[PDB]
């Protein structure tokens, strides 16, 4: 009868299966198909993807959590449980014979109000504190679950950052290198100041360690050349074989002996190196590396100041790459050469360790989400404390807002705040807590001369200061959260009717 009271209901089990994955604590369920492939995991964005949905009315409420992939990159769990709950609490309203137009505006109203005041709740920091970017820097490492090096690493990645900070202060996913390599332990982790290279001498013979070298790009193989048109040879004098060998080689030897004039001892050329031309090259001992990465060339000129090489007949001294510190040692396995600049560093590395190919991958995809969650504060300088700190004030904040709204349509703006309290409510069932006799205990400590810091705790049930424990987050998160819940939820309330599009997948 009501088409719309079956519409919204399709995506609450949507939502409510997935509505104790917030954290680590939460069974999770599996949709196998008809073939097989038991595959379960925590993550949410992932279920979600790998999901077949009935109904295409369901898309439009999880299509808003794939913008947050990329501009926040996290929290999208908590911005799609939180719009969930408000479709069952507009449920009691709706009953009331009141339409949908005077509940849309009162959303809007509130949403657009909400952001003014949870900037007066929110903190100040600065933009090269380390005692307090490091507690955060933790909380996005340990959703993990590794522990034996938790807080060894992080310091890692908190200086790694640092020495990055541009005057705008803006990330640029780039300069900054990425190596892995499986090991013993996870805590084999150590900081880089230099840029490293896997490219290894194509022969031993060719020297190992040189000590203060120039380093030298190039992008050309040598092999023979031919036009578009057709034009074949023919060779029917086998007399004249060991002839012309010794001409060909003097049109190569030329070749390798200009790098060496021009000023460098070493070598990194981009296409493979021909089998005869190996010869030459260990012959006089210039170190060269066959098929190298077209994306090298770029950013190590970039952060050397090199300049890249297409021929190789021109190649002045301007022309050469320059270098700080060349080395190549070991690190407990394979060895690899080292490419510092001292005199003008502009490029940070880290040596990834673990002790299988499927962790040294997840320990690197940690570090993404740190590097990125590091400049939403470096940016802003705001950040707001964890466990339901900001929706526990902001539900109380809005209450005296409300009051000046008169009117009857006033429990509608009442009703989206009271929404509100799925954070602290969720934690509290896999943790076995019941919700009704700690939701009362968190208002007494936000009366109203009390600390705005204070919250949950997860560890231990008790209540303490977020930020002496180590749990903080930026602001943005709680803002696009209840922004864009706010907002999607217009999509699914303001229906009225049924569409009938033919064939809609």
Not at 282 to 306: C, H, P, Q
């Amino acid at each position: 009868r009501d088409a719309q009271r079956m519409n919204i209901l399709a995506g609450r089990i949507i939502a409510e299966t997935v509505r104790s994955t917030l954290g680590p604590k939460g069974m999770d369920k599996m949709l196998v198909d008809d073939l097989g492939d038991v595959v379960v995991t925590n993550d949410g964005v992932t279920i979600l993807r790998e999901m077949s949905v009935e109904h295409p009315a369901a898309k439009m409420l999880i299509e808003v959590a794939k913008t947050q992939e990329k501009e926040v990159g996290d929290g999208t769990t908590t911005a799609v449980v939180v719009a969930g709950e408000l479709l069952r609490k507009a449920e009691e309203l709706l009953d009331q014979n009141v339409h949908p137009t005077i509940v849309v505006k009162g959303y809007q109203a509130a949403a657009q109000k909400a952001q003014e005041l949870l900037k007066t709740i929110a903190c100040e920091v600065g933009a090269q504190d380390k005692e307090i970017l490091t507690k955060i820097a933790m909380t996005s490492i340990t959703g993990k679950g590794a522990e034996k090096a938790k807080e060894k690493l992080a310091e890692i990645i908190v200086e790694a950052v640092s020495a990055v900070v541009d005057d705008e202060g803006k990330v640029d996913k780039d300069l900054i290198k990425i190596e892995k390599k499986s090991g013993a332990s996870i805590d084999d982790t150590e900081l880089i100041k230099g840029v490293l290279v896997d490219k290894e001498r194509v022969s031993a013979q060719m020297p190992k360690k040189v000590t203060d070298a120039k380093i030298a790009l190039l992008n050309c193989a040598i092999e023979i050349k031919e036009t578009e048109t057709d034009a074949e040879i023919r060779i029917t004098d086998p007399a004249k074989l060991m002839e012309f060998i010794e001409q060909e080689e003097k049109m190569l030897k030329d070749m390798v002996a200009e790098i060496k004039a021009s000023g460098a001892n070493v070598l990194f050329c981009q296409k493979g190196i021909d089998d005869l031309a190996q010869h030459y090259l260990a012959k006089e001992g210039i170190v060269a590396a066959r098929r190298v990465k077209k994306s090298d060339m770029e950013k190590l000129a970039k952060a050397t100041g090199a300049n890249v090489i297409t021929n190789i007949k021109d190649l002045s001294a301007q022309d050469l790459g320059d270098a700080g510190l060349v080395e190549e040692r070991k690190i407990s396995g394979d060895s690899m050469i080292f490419v510092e600049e001292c005199k003008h560093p502009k490029a940070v590395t880290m040596l990834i360790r673990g002790t299988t190919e499927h962790v040294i991958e997840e320990v690197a995809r940690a570090v993404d989400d740190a590097v990125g969650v590091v400049g939403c504060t470096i940016e802003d300088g705001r950040i707001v404390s964890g466990g339901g700190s900001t929706e526990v004030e902001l539900s109380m904040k809005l209450r005296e807002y409300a009051e000046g709204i008169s009117g009857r349509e006033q429990l509608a703006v009442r009703a989206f705040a009271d929404a509100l309290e799925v954070i602290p409510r969720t934690l509290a069932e896999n943790a076995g807590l019941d919700a009704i006799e700690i939701l009362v205990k968190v208002r007494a400590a936000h009366a109203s001369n009390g600390n705005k810091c204070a919250g949950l705790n997860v560890f231990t049930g008790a209540v303490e200061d977020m930020c002496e424990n180590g749990v903080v987050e930026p602001l943005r998160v709680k803002t696009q959260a209840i922004q864009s819940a706010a907002e999607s939820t217009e999509m699914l309330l303001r229906i009225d009717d049924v569409i009938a599009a033919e064939k809609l997948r």
